Each structure stands twice: as C-alpha cells, then as structure tokens.
Amino acid sequence: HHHHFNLPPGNYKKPKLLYCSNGGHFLRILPDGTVDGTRDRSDQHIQWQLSAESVGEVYIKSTETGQYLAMDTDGLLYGSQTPNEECLFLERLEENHYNTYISKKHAEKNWFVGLKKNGSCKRGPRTHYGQKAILFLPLPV
C-alpha cells in the first residue's frame, strides 16, 4: 500500500451530495461530461451514488446522467460511460472527519479529486495532502 487505511464510517446505501469545504461547492457532472462544483443545491447534476468494488475502493456515479466520475492520464476529471481503471478511487477518512478520494490508477502520485474555491476542478498533480480542496463531506440528498 502507498496510503493509510483509515476509512470513513458510513455506507453506500443511499445516494449523496459531495460537498467540498474549500469553497462550499457540490461536486457536479453535466450530461456532456463537464465536471465542476456549484453552490446551487437545487442543481440536478450533483447527486452521486457510490459503490465499493473492494474495501475502500469506490466508483462514484452520477444518478442523473449515469456517468462514472474518472480521472484521465493528465489528471483531469471526466465522465466515463462505462467503468474502467480510471473510475476507481481510494475513499479514505481525513483529519478524522472528511472523506478524500485518491485516483487508484495514479495512487503513487497522490492525485486526488478536488475543487478550488472558484468551483473549478483541480488537476491531479496540483492536489496533495493538506489541502482543503480535497476534503469532502457526503451529504444526504
């Protein structure tokens, strides 16, 4: 393993909103695959269903569009129609409270899912332990 194994105390029984404390944005993915963050809780593209493939390994899927959140070879988040190795994330507890998501594919480089204060997604190499951009709080829908 290249990462710790502190896991968040929760399940995948129901869909969730992925709230980012950094700028207070909900993770969003449009039908065309555009990924970003919005503070509009009425938005119809911020609902996600997570599922575990292995303990601590999750798929993060848009309930509205059916797309899987994924990070590409350049560290850009995108929406994949079908599950692939770029769609798996290591879901972990952080600062004993939040959830972080590390790209399994690029785990050795510590590339995380993250949102800047202006609501734009961070590129993998620009993320790292210690940022508020990578801290999420799963909220009920």
CB 68 within 8 A of CB 35: no
Q: How far apart are CA 17 and CA 26, in angstroms?
A: 6
Contacts of 101 (CB under 8 A, 6+ apart): 58, 60, 89, 90, 91, 92, 112, 113, 134, 136
Site of tokens 């569009």: 65
Q: How far apart are CA 139 and CA 86, in angstroms?
A: 24
* 6 in a labelled binding site: no
Q: 70-94: b or e for each residue (b if 16 or more CB lie within 10 Å)?
A: bbeeebebbbbeeeeebbbbbbbbb
User: Which residue ranges make up the annotated binding site?
Assistant: 22
User: Which residue ranges make up the annotated binding site for heparin?
Assistant: 22
